[PDB]
Design an enzyme around this catalytic site. Structure first.
Site, PDB file in Angstrom:
ATOM      1  N   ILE A  13       0.805  -1.217   0.000  1.00 27.22           N
ATOM      2  CA  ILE A  13       0.000   0.000   0.000  1.00 27.22           C
ATOM      3  C   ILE A  13       0.840   1.270   0.000  1.00 27.22           C
ATOM      4  CG2 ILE A  13      -1.997  -1.136   1.015  1.00 27.22           C
ATOM      5  CD1 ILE A  13      -1.159  -0.035   3.739  1.00 27.22           C
ATOM      6  N   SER A  15       5.270   2.932  -0.512  1.00 26.75           N
ATOM      7  CA  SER A  15       6.719   2.814  -0.527  1.00 26.75           C
ATOM      8  C   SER A  15       7.314   4.211  -0.544  1.00 26.75           C
ATOM      9  CB  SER A  15       7.220   2.002  -1.727  1.00 26.75           C
ATOM     10  OG  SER A  15       6.315   2.082  -2.815  1.00 26.75           O
ATOM     11  N   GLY A  16       8.590   4.288  -0.200  1.00 21.99           N
ATOM     12  CA  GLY A  16       9.276   5.561  -0.164  1.00 21.99           C
ATOM     13  C   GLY A  16      10.477   5.500   0.757  1.00 21.99           C
ATOM     14  N   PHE A  18      10.548   6.065   3.712  1.00 23.32           N
ATOM     15  CA  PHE A  18      10.126   5.379   4.930  1.00 23.32           C
ATOM     16  C   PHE A  18      10.203   3.861   4.818  1.00 23.32           C
ATOM     17  CE2 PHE A  18       6.498   6.325   2.235  1.00 23.32           C
ATOM     18  CZ  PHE A  18       5.858   5.108   2.133  1.00 23.32           C
ATOM     19  N   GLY A  19      10.541   3.324   3.649  1.00 19.26           N
ATOM     20  CA  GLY A  19      10.507   1.892   3.418  1.00 19.26           C
ATOM     21  C   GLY A  19       9.312   1.520   2.568  1.00 19.26           C
ATOM     22  N   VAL A  21       5.167  -0.388   3.000  1.00 17.78           N
ATOM     23  CA  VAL A  21       4.110  -0.724   3.944  1.00 17.78           C
ATOM     24  C   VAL A  21       3.150  -1.689   3.262  1.00 17.78           C
ATOM     25  CG1 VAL A  21       2.319   0.189   5.464  1.00 17.78           C
ATOM     26  CG2 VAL A  21       4.354   1.568   4.967  1.00 17.78           C
ATOM     27  N   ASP A 134       5.726  16.920  12.752  1.00 19.52           N
ATOM     28  CA  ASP A 134       5.709  16.590  11.330  1.00 19.52           C
ATOM     29  C   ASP A 134       4.265  16.422  10.860  1.00 19.52           C
ATOM     30  OD1 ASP A 134       6.975  16.259   8.890  1.00 19.52           O
ATOM     31  OD2 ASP A 134       7.250  14.097   9.148  1.00 19.52           O
ATOM     32  N   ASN A 139       0.804  12.396   6.701  1.00 26.57           N
ATOM     33  CA  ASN A 139       0.871  11.820   8.041  1.00 26.57           C
ATOM     34  C   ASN A 139      -0.484  11.828   8.740  1.00 26.57           C
ATOM     35  OD1 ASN A 139       3.573  11.198   7.857  1.00 26.57           O
ATOM     36  ND2 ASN A 139       4.277  13.055   8.891  1.00 26.57           N
ATOM     37  N   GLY A 154       7.582   9.591  14.380  1.00 26.27           N
ATOM     38  CA  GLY A 154       9.031   9.546  14.435  1.00 26.27           C
ATOM     39  C   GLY A 154       9.679  10.846  14.862  1.00 26.27           C
TER      40      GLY A 154
HETATM   41  C1  LIG Z   1      -7.068  -2.966  -3.501  1.00 24.93           C
HETATM   42  C2  LIG Z   1      -6.882  -2.038  -2.369  1.00 24.93           C
HETATM   43  O1  LIG Z   1      -7.261  -2.402  -1.221  1.00 24.93           O
HETATM   44  N1  LIG Z   1      -6.307  -0.814  -2.573  1.00 24.93           N
HETATM   45  C3  LIG Z   1      -6.438   0.274  -1.653  1.00 24.93           C
HETATM   46  C4  LIG Z   1      -5.207   1.101  -1.501  1.00 24.93           C
HETATM   47  O2  LIG Z   1      -4.205   0.841  -2.223  1.00 24.93           O
HETATM   48  N2  LIG Z   1      -5.129   2.143  -0.602  1.00 24.93           N
HETATM   49  C5  LIG Z   1      -6.065   2.504   0.414  1.00 24.93           C
HETATM   50  C6  LIG Z   1      -6.685   3.815  -0.167  1.00 24.93           C
HETATM   51  C7  LIG Z   1      -5.468   4.446  -0.897  1.00 24.93           C
HETATM   52  C8  LIG Z   1      -4.362   3.350  -0.716  1.00 24.93           C
HETATM   53  C9  LIG Z   1      -3.910   3.287   0.681  1.00 24.93           C
HETATM   54  C10 LIG Z   1      -2.713   3.644   1.309  1.00 24.93           C
HETATM   55  C11 LIG Z   1      -2.627   3.441   2.704  1.00 24.93           C
HETATM   56  C12 LIG Z   1      -3.701   2.893   3.454  1.00 24.93           C
HETATM   57  N3  LIG Z   1      -3.602   2.716   4.804  1.00 24.93           N
HETATM   58  C13 LIG Z   1      -2.608   2.866   5.728  1.00 24.93           C
HETATM   59  N4  LIG Z   1      -2.817   2.554   7.027  1.00 24.93           N
HETATM   60  C14 LIG Z   1      -1.869   2.676   7.975  1.00 24.93           C
HETATM   61  C15 LIG Z   1      -0.591   3.158   7.654  1.00 24.93           C
HETATM   62  C16 LIG Z   1       0.446   3.275   8.716  1.00 24.93           C
HETATM   63  F1  LIG Z   1       1.497   2.475   8.395  1.00 24.93           F
HETATM   64  F2  LIG Z   1       0.930   4.554   8.893  1.00 24.93           F
HETATM   65  F3  LIG Z   1      -0.016   2.873   9.932  1.00 24.93           F
HETATM   66  C17 LIG Z   1      -0.377   3.483   6.290  1.00 24.93           C
HETATM   67  N5  LIG Z   1       0.819   3.958   5.854  1.00 24.93           N
HETATM   68  C18 LIG Z   1       0.961   4.611   4.591  1.00 24.93           C
HETATM   69  C19 LIG Z   1       1.263   3.625   3.446  1.00 24.93           C
HETATM   70  C20 LIG Z   1       2.288   4.638   2.924  1.00 24.93           C
HETATM   71  C21 LIG Z   1       2.379   5.176   4.361  1.00 24.93           C
HETATM   72  N6  LIG Z   1      -1.384   3.329   5.394  1.00 24.93           N
HETATM   73  C22 LIG Z   1      -4.901   2.550   2.781  1.00 24.93           C
HETATM   74  C23 LIG Z   1      -4.984   2.753   1.396  1.00 24.93           C
END
Ligand SMILES: CC(=O)NCC(=O)N1[C@@H]2CC[C@H]1c1ccc(Nc3ncc(C(F)(F)F)c(NC4CCC4)n3)cc12
Ligand SMILES: [Cl-]
Ligand SMILES: [Cl-]
EC number: 2.7.10.2
Length: 258
Positions: A13, A15-16, A18-19, A21, A134, A139, A154
């Site tokens: 979900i 990358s960057g 920060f690594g 996720v 930040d 964020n 962080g």
């Molecule tokens: C098929 C599918 O489920 N796709 C959805 C998807 O790709 N997502 C959903 C909506 C936009 C994108 C996306 C990015 C991040 C999250 N959720 C999430 N939750 C907790 C963290 C946490 F790690 F901070 F806790 C986090 N970190 C982001 C990822 C880049 C930094 N992201 C949900 C989504």
């Protein structure tokens, strides 16, 4: 491997720097978590203090409805794994970028809701003698009937005897850049105002130059949509050049606007 033993990986979900996720199911409880995979920080380095800052912050704060929960952290080979709450709405940055795609936008009522919810997270953090340092759309996270949650702790440090690692220069108050670490809660307020400005559809914020200083003189970026002149005035005083003029999170969340 603990990672594969107790989790099943569903989808990358993010990358960057920060690594990366991953959205994962934990096998034992069937719940969804966002697991961050980073290079194991060099011992004694900046990245290590960032990661221990994050640990300390969540240990102080515990669970809060407006902070992304932090469950565990461990190492495997030369990488660090962090298990976080999964927010199914992505980050505010994702929601903003989505608004440009479909030509939608956050109305005043939604912008006020965003300000109040994050303001309450900040209210709790500041009440615990911490500052976030930040605040920015990437964020802020969204659980969807909408909950906004402050993530990536962080840069969190203590109000007394702070260790400041400057945040994104686009959201940084001038006094912090001036190594004035004496009103840091008002730096979070400043960055929250500009975070809301971004959500409102403003152009990308400047990293430096004439426009950067113009904002730090209290000049609010131009917002295309129409807002009540008093909501605009609220955002303006949140970026007032004098930090003591900006409202505290406490004052912000008891502020009249609902
Ligand atoms: C098929 C599918 O489920 N796709 C959805 C998807 O790709 N997502 C959903 C909506 C936009 C994108 C996306 C990015 C991040 C999250 N959720 C999430 N939750 C907790 C963290 C946490 F790690 F901070 F806790 C986090 N970190 C982001 C990822 C880049 C930094 N992201 C949900 C989504
Ligand atoms: Cl590796
Ligand atoms: Cl690897």
């Amino acid at each position: 491997s603990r990672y594969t033993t107790e989790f099943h990986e569903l989808e990358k979900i993010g990358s960057g720097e920060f690594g990366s996720v991953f959205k994962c199911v934990k096998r034992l409880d069937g719940c969804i978590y966002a697991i961050k995979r980073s290079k194991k920080p060099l011992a004694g380095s900046v990245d290590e203090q960032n990661a221990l800052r994050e640990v300390y912050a969540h240990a102080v704060l515990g669970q809060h409805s407006h902070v992304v929960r932090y469950f565990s952290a461990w190492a495997e080979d030369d990488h660090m794994l962090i298990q976080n709450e999964y927010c199914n709405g992505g980050s505010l940055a994702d929601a903003i970028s989505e608004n440009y795609r479909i030509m939608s936008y956050f109305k005043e009522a939604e912008l006020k809701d965003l300000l109040l919810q994050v303001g309450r997270g900040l209210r709790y953090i500041h009440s615990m003698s911490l500052v976030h340092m930040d605040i920015k759309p990437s964020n802020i996270f969204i659980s969807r009937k909408v909950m906004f949650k402050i993530g990536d702790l962080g840069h969190v440090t203590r109000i007394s005897s702070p260790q400041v690692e400057e945040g994104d220069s686009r959201f940084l108050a001038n006094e912090v850049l001036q190594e004035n670490y004496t009103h840091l809660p008002k730096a979070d307020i400043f960055a929250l105002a500009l975070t809301v400005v971004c959500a409102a559809g403003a152009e990308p914020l400047p990293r430096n130059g004439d426009q950067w200083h113009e904002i730090r003189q209290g000049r609010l970026p131009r917002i295309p949509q129409v807002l009540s002149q008093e909501f605009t005035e609220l955002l303006k005083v949140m970026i007032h050049p004098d930090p003591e003029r900006r409202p505290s999170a406490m004052a912000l969340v008891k502020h009249s606007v609902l």
